[PDB]
Design a protein around this ligand. Structure first.
Ligand SMILES: CC(C)=CCC/C(C)=C/CC/C(C)=C/CSP(=O)(O)OP(=O)(O)O
Ligand SMILES: [Mg+2]
Length: 343
């Protein structure tokens, strides 16, 4: 039965302490940087948060523990200051949205109102006014999508539209055995909401990758590998948080269930998977359609793949610099995380 399978996992992982190596070391060629105006933008974000129709205590818990302006600052360390507000706001949207919707009918209603908002704002007849009904996490999305679209070409807008629809519908669609690990991992590859952040590098850096390059197999592979990398490192980094509220559909635990690995072996398996996909990602760059003549085009290709890589390294770097997933005291002097599956 479900309970039996979930029972044994809780028993097998409970109170386990697992020291995790510094994940950024597994991606050595990809550096972590910080946008230089994070503090100043956070002042603006704090004032803006006062008007978001989310509960004060909830907005402050997100700001205090997740501090998504910092995540935007690591994803987009070289953007100009004026781009940082909309990037940070979007990240507060997606984490607030995910939180409120984390009841079948409520999820169905909100997803449809959110898809409506996405179409309203990014589609062929733009309407940025929220309907009078709108719940807080939908009402706040209209000005965010409007501001992003103002800095995007219609080519990038179409990609952001489809990527946001994919994320929304992945959440709606996900509602006797724990799931198979590959099934879970592949589900997160399809549904995880990292791809709108790759596209927002085009807002952040004020460029458009041509679609013929975006559809090239090497670019498609770099986007995919970086999506897989972000997910994999998140499986490890979020394990303590997820296990503490007994959300056992965590890749590490699914490896424990399906293959009877220890929690130590399972985490080591995910780390191996990160090394494989990083090496695959690195190989794809030589296959990209680099121009022999066009400096601007090659700077755009460069920037776009750096956006992809910073999603992987930046997600890690941010997790090591906030308390969304663990207490920062759990990191030692060389940034090894001591997971604690106590509860
Ligand atoms: C960390 C990561 C993969 C991405 C950060 C940047 C973006 C755009 C993430 C997608 C949005 C959400 C809700 C991620 C939560 S996965 P979780 O493990 O942090 O939260 P959960 O434990 O599933 O509630
Ligand atoms: Mg997770």
């Amino acid at each position: 039965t479900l309970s039996g399978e979930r029972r044994e996992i809780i028993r097998r992982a409970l109170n386990k302490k697992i020291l995790v190596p510094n994940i950024l070391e597994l991606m050595p060629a990809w550096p972590s940087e910080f946008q230089p105006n994070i503090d100043e933008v956070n002042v603006e974000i704090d004032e803006w948060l006062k008007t978001v129709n989310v509960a004060k205590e909830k907005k402050l818990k997100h700001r205090a523990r997740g501090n998504y302006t910092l995540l935007a600052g690591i994803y987009y360390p070289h953007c100009r200051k004026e781009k940082m507000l909309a990037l940070s706001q979007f990240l507060y949207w997606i984490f607030f949205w995910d939180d409120e919707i984390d009841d079948r009918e409520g999820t169905i209603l909100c997803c449809a109102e959110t898809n409506k908002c996405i179409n309203d704002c990014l589609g062929p007849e733009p309407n940025y006014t929220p309907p009078p009904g709108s719940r807080g996490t939908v009402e706040m999305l209209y000005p965010i999508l409007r501001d992003l679209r103002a800095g995007l070409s219609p080519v990038s807008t179409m990609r952001l539209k489809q990527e946001l629809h994919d994320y929304v519908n992945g959440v709606k669609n996900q509602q006797d055995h724990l799931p198979n690990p590959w099934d879970h991992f592949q589900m997160r590859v399809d549904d995880v909401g990292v791809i709108p952040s790759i596209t927002q590098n085009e807002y952040a850096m004020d460029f458009t990758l041509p679609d013929w390059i975006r559809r090239h197999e090497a670019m498609e592979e770099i986007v995919l590998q970086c999506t897989k990398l972000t997910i994999l490192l998140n499986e490890i980094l979020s394990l303590q948080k997820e296990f503490r509220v007994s959300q056992l559909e965590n890749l590490c635990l699914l490896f424990m269930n399906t293959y009877d690995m220890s929690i130590e072996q399972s985490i080591h398996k995910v780390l191996g998977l990160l090394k494989d996909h990083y090496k695959i990602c690195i190989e794809a760059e030589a296959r990209l359609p680099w121009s022999t003549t066009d400096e601007k085009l090659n700077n755009n290709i460069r920037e776009y793949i750096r956006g992809c890589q910073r999603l992987a390294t930046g997600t890690a770097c941010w997790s090591y610099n906030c308390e969304r997933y663990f207490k920062l005291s759990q990191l030692n002097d060389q940034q090894e995380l001591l997971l604690d599956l106590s509860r």
